[PDB]
Design an enzyme around this catalytic site. Structure first.
Site, PDB file in Angstrom:
ATOM      1  N   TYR A  64      10.223 -16.666 -49.206  1.00  0.00           N
ATOM      2  CA  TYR A  64      10.726 -15.644 -50.137  1.00  0.00           C
ATOM      3  C   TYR A  64       9.612 -14.699 -50.616  1.00  0.00           C
ATOM      4  CZ  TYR A  64      15.513 -17.144 -49.832  1.00  0.00           C
ATOM      5  OH  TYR A  64      16.753 -17.510 -49.371  1.00  0.00           O
ATOM      6  N   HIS A 120      25.346 -12.012 -53.647  1.00  0.00           N
ATOM      7  CA  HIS A 120      24.470 -13.069 -53.137  1.00  0.00           C
ATOM      8  C   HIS A 120      23.184 -13.212 -53.960  1.00  0.00           C
ATOM      9  CE1 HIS A 120      26.267 -13.200 -48.802  1.00  0.00           C
ATOM     10  NE2 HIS A 120      26.992 -13.865 -49.682  1.00  0.00           N
ATOM     11  N   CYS A 174      10.033 -25.013 -71.901  1.00  0.00           N
ATOM     12  CA  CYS A 174      10.734 -25.371 -70.675  1.00  0.00           C
ATOM     13  C   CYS A 174       9.657 -25.604 -69.618  1.00  0.00           C
ATOM     14  CB  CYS A 174      11.700 -24.270 -70.247  1.00  0.00           C
ATOM     15  SG  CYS A 174      12.388 -24.551 -68.628  1.00  0.00           S
ATOM     16  N   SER A 213      31.536  -5.680 -41.138  1.00  0.00           N
ATOM     17  CA  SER A 213      32.921  -5.490 -40.675  1.00  0.00           C
ATOM     18  C   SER A 213      33.987  -6.001 -41.641  1.00  0.00           C
ATOM     19  CB  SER A 213      33.115  -6.175 -39.325  1.00  0.00           C
ATOM     20  OG  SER A 213      34.395  -5.885 -38.821  1.00  0.00           O
TER      21      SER A 213
HETATM   22 ZN   LIG Z   1      13.379 -22.540 -67.992  1.00  0.00          ZN
END
Ligand SMILES: [Zn+2]
EC number: 2.3.1.-
Lengths: 262, 8
Positions: A64, A120, A174, A213
């Site tokens: 990526y 997506h 986090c 298509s």
């Molecule tokens: Zn987080």
């Protein structure tokens, strides 16, 4: 017949434009599906899955990162631009244009399109695997450990970055592992997004299908719904149809579409 | 939920 299409275009109050990988291939943007579509030993299908990410997150992030980095040199094409300027022009006249894209390259955004549904996800968004937060991210490189990594040659050595040094969540509490906010093979499309798309498709009075298509996916989900309302559908793609043949403009959409949408 | 590419 271009003139018959343009008669519908002149009258349409709400256009839905669905775009597939053909519109991104013409910007020089590898898809990774098809004979050319190798990155190191792998094709997209092997890597864009939660099993690949679970078992080798560094490899999937290298892939990526490569893709993010290559977008720096690729630019929107005349099809992307025509779509953006069409939306702007028609918006001023009280007419709606919405783009429903399979593509994760953000090229429609870079072209100027505002009303865009990225079904997506996007190469340039992250989602935290821990707290779920979604954030836009255009940093080059996304984290220091990835700097200069992602080379596409088969015998390029793996970075093997410890997971703690891959992109992390920035809420200092986090710190979860980030993933690209992209729909992977084996994952469901977002329900909320699909509900919005259904609303737009149901209200539209003309639909264009560009660089993919109507008969293939994802167009096959939604173009039938519009066709069954009696709404004209116009395909712009390089694909042929047979000789015994709604509307089809064969060729590169960066040639066909600016003329169609004038 | 819709499987990406119908799961094909
Ligand atoms: Zn987080």
């Amino acid at each position: 017949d271009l003139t018959a299409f343009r008669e519908h275009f002149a009258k349409a109050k709400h256009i839905a434009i669905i775009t597939g990988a053909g519109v991104s291939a013409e910007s020089g943007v590898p898809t990774f599906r098809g004979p050319g579509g190798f990155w190191r030993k792998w094709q997209a299908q092997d890597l864009a899955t939660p099993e690949a990410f679970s078992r080798d997150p560094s490899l999937v992030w290298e892939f990526y990162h490569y893709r993010r980095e290559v977008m720096r040199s690729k630019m929107p094409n005349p099809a992307h631009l025509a779509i953006a300027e069409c939306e702007a022009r028609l918006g001023q006249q009280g007419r709606s244009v919405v783009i429903i894209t399979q593509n994760i390259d953000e090229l429609h955004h870079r072209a100027g399109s505002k009303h865009v549904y990225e079904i997506h996800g996007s190469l340039f968004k992250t989602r935290c695997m821990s707290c779920g937060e979604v954030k836009a991210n255009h940093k080059s490189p996304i984290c220091p450990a990835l700097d200069g990594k992602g080379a596409p040659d088969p015998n390029t050595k793996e970075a093997r970055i410890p997971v703690e040094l891959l992109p992390r969540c920035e809420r200092k509490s986090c710190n979860g592992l980030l993933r690209p906010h992209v729909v992977w093979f084996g994952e469901t499309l977002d329900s909320d997004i699909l509900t919005a798309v259904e609303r737009e498709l149901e209200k539209c009075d003309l639909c264009l299908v560009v660089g993919t298509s109507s008969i293939v996916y994802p167009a096959a989900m939604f173009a039938p719904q519009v066709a069954s309302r009696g709404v004209p559908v116009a395909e712009f793609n390089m694909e042929c149809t047979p000789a015994t043949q709604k509307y089809h403009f064969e060729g590169p959409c960066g040639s066909t579409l600016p003329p169609a949408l004038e | 939920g819709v499987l990406k590419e119908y799961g094909v």
